[PDB]
A paper describes a structure:
In addition, crystallographic characterization of the cytoplasmic core of SteA revealed a homodimeric organization harboring a conserved functional pocket similar to the phosphonucleotide-binding site of thiamine pyrophosphokinase. These data, coupled with the in vivo phenotypic analysis of a steAB knockout mutant of Cglu , support a model in which the transmembrane SteAB heterotetramer, driven by cytoplasmic ligand binding, orchestrates the productive periplasmic positioning of RipA, leading to PG hydrolysis activation.
D,L-endopeptidase RipA is the major PG hydrolase required for daughter cell separation in Mycobacterium tuberculosis ( Mtb ), as RipA defects severely hinder cell division and increase antibiotic vulnerability. Despite extensive studies, the mechanisms governing Mtb RipA regulation remain controversial and poorly understood. Here, we report an integrative structural and functional analysis of the SteAB system, a regulatory complex that has been shown to modulate cell separation in the model organism Corynebacterium glutamicum ( Cglu ) and is conserved across Mycobacteriales .
Numbering used by the authors:
A (entry chain H): 16 to 342
B (entry chain A): 12 to 342
C-alpha cells in the first residue's frame, strides 16, 4: 500500500490533512471511538499504531470500526515508527506489516486482522467483568467491615473547630503536586483555606512557605521541617490503636493525634477527617481517583479510594478545577 | 413523691444553645432519628439523666453506635414520642419520666415514649448492620450488571450524539430541576457572566434557564415536560431514547420543526444522560447544578438506588464540581 505518511493525534494533528488512501501514523493504545470515527471519515488505506489497538483491559470497538471500513490495521511498531517518519512522504506498507521509504526499512509492525480484533475485544470484555466482579465484591466487604468509620466516623480524631465552615485544601504527593500547588497560589492567598499536608506533600507545603494546620501520615516518611512547623500531626494507627512513628513524635516533643483504622491510604484518611469536621468545601490536590482509572488498572484497585470520594459527595473539588478558574 | 426520674426538660439540637447549657441530671429533649456519634458524644459529656427522642434512635437503615454510647454512660433512652413532645415541652421545667417511658409535669401527662434498653439498642444496631449489607449486596450486584451490559456506553460512548465542537475545552454548566435550583442559578450569575460556560438545561430546568434570560446551547429530556419557550429558544434538543432508538416526545419536536438528536440508552435519568454527554465531548470542567448524588444518599435510601447515578459521577471524575462549591467562591 503506497500513500503519504501522516502523523495523527486525537487532538487534531494531521486529521485535517489526512486524505483518502494514505498511511496514518498514530500512537493510540486502546483506540477511542471518537478517534476511530475521525480516522474512518478520512478514508485512509492503513492505520499504523506505535502501541496496541486493544491492550486487553477494556472492550474498545474503535479498531473493529476501522477494519469494517476496509482499513488495514498494523500495530506495535514502537517508538522507531515516530522517530523515522517524514510527515507527508510517500511510504509503502507491505501485507506483512513492514513500512518502507522506497527500498529502505523504517519499522516492523504486527497486522491486526478482523477476527483477531474481535477476539481481543471479547477477551477484554471478559477481563473487565472479572475485574469488576472482584472490585465491587471488595466494595461490599469494605462497607460491611468499615461501616463504623463510613457511617459514624469511629476513630476520626477531633482536631478542634478550625475546619468547620471553612474551605479546606488537602495536598498529597501525587505526580506534579508541587506545580499544581503553585498554580493555586492566588486561590490560597485569596481564600485562606485550612491546609492539610499528606505524607511528603507536607514537606512541599512547608518548602513553598506555607504553615499547614494539619499533617496526616506516618512521621517516618515526613521531613523534620514539616513536623516541626507547628501543624497538628495525625498518625495513622492499626484498628487496635498502634501508631507507627509515635516514638519520633515523642522525641520531637510535639502534639499529635492518632487515627485508628483499616484504611491504608493517608490521602483517604485526610479526606475522611476533613469531611467529618463539616467544611464548606474540600480541594483535593495530588490525589485524583477516577472510574476510568479503576477500569484501566490491570491490577486490583482499592475500593476505599472511590468510596471516600463518593462519601465526600458535593463538597469535593479537584485542584485542577479550581486552577482552571485562574487560567 | 411520684415515681420516676426528675429533672429539667431542655430542648437540644445538634447545633443549638440547648447543649451549651444542658446540665447534669436534666431530661434532654431531642428530635434525632439515627442519632449521630458527634451529637451522642456532646449529649454524653453533659451527663443528662435521660435523652427523650421524638423519633427512633436507630431507624434501621444504618448501624449507628451513638445510642449505645449513651446507654453505656448510664443515661435512660426513651424514643418515638412524636411531635407532641416538642409541642408540650417547657424549657427548664422539672419533668418526671417513669420507668414505662411516660413524661409528666407533676400529675399531667405530656407524652408516651418507648424505653430503649441496652440489649434492645444492640439488637437494633445488629439488624441495621444486616439490612445495610443486604442493600449493598443488591446495589453493587446491580452496579456490576450495569457495567457489563452498558460497557459500550461507559467505555466507548456508544449512543452519545455528536453535538459539535462547542463543548470541547470549555467550562460546562448543567442545570437540573432539583430543590432550589433557581436560587442556585441566581447565585451563579457572576460565574456565568465571567466565564461564559456552555449551558445545558435538563427537563424543567431548561425553562428556568430561559426565564432567567439565558440561551442554553443544549436541552436534555423528554420534550413533553419542557416548556415551549425553552424548546423554541434555539438550543439543540437531546431526546432520551430506548436502546432500540424510540424517543418519547419526538412528535412534539417534529410539530415544532426544530433540530433534535436522540440518545438511545438504558439510563433513566436525563441528568445522568446530560453529564455523560458533556463528559464525552471533553470539556475543561462540568459544573453540576440541581442534581446532587452522594454515597450517604445510597446508605440512607432503604428503597432501591440507581447505580447509574453514582457511576456517572465517578465516570466524570476530576472534571465534576457541584454548583454549591462554585457558589461558595462568591459568598
Amino acid at each position: 500500500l503506497q500513500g503519504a505518511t501522516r502523523i495523527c493525534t486525537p487532538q487534531g494533528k494531521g486529521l485535517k490533512r489526512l486524505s483518502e488512501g494514505d498511511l496514518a501514523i498514530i500512537d493510540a493504545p486502546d483506540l477511542s471511538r471518537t478517534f476511530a470515527q475521525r480516522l474512518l471519515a478520512a478514508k485512509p488505506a492503513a492505520v499504523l499504531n506505535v502501541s496496541r489497538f486493544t491492550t486487553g483491559s477494556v472492550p474498545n470497538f474503535g479498531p473493529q470500526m476501522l477494519i469494517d471500513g476496509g482499513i488495514q490495521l498494523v500495530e506495535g511498531f514502537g517508538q522507531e515508527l515516530l522517530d523515522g517518519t517524514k510527515d507527508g512522504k510517500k511510504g509503502r506498507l507491505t501485507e506483512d506489516g513492514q513500512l518502507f521509504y522506497g527500498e529502505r526499512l523504517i519499522s516492523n509492525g504486527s497486522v491486526l486482522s478482523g477476527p483477531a480484533a474481535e477476539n481481543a475485544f471479547a477477551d477484554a470484555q471478559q477481563s473487565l467483568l472479572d475485574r469488576m466482579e472482584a472490585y465491587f465484591g471488595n466494595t461490599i466487604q469494605f462497607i460491611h467491615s468499615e461501616a463504623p468509620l463510613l457511617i459514624d466516623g469511629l476513630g476520626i480524631p477531633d482536631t478542634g473547630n478550625a475546619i468547620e465552615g471553612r474551605k479546606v485544601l488537602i495536598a498529597s504527593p501525587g505526580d506534579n503536586h508541587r506545580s499544581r500547588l503553585k498554580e493555586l497560589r492566588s486561590f490560597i492567598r485569596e481564600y485562606d483555606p485550612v491546609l492539610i499536608g499528606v505524607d511528603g506533600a507536607a514537606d512541599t507545603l512547608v518548602e513553598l512557605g506555607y504553615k499547614p494546620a494539619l499533617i496526616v501520615g506516618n512521621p517516618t516518611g515526613i521531613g523534620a521541617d514539616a513536623l516541626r512547623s507547628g501543624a497538628n500531626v495525625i498518625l495513622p494507627a492499626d484498628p487496635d490503636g498502634h501508631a507507627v512513628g509515635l516514638e519520633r513524635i515523642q522525641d520531637l516533643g510535639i502534639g499529635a493525634m492518632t487515627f485508628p483504622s483499616s484504611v491504608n491510604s493517608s490521602t483517604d484518611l485526610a479526606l475522611l477527617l476533613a469531611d467529618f469536621h463539616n467544611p464548606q468545601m474540600i480541594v483535593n490536590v495530588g490525589g485524583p481517583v477516577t472510574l476510568d482509572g479503576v477500569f484501566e488498572n490491570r491490577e486490583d484497585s482499592d475500593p476505599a479510594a472511590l468510596l471516600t470520594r463518593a462519601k465526600l459527595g458535593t463538597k469535593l473539588v479537584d485542584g485542577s478545577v479550581i486552577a482552571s478558574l485562574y487560567t
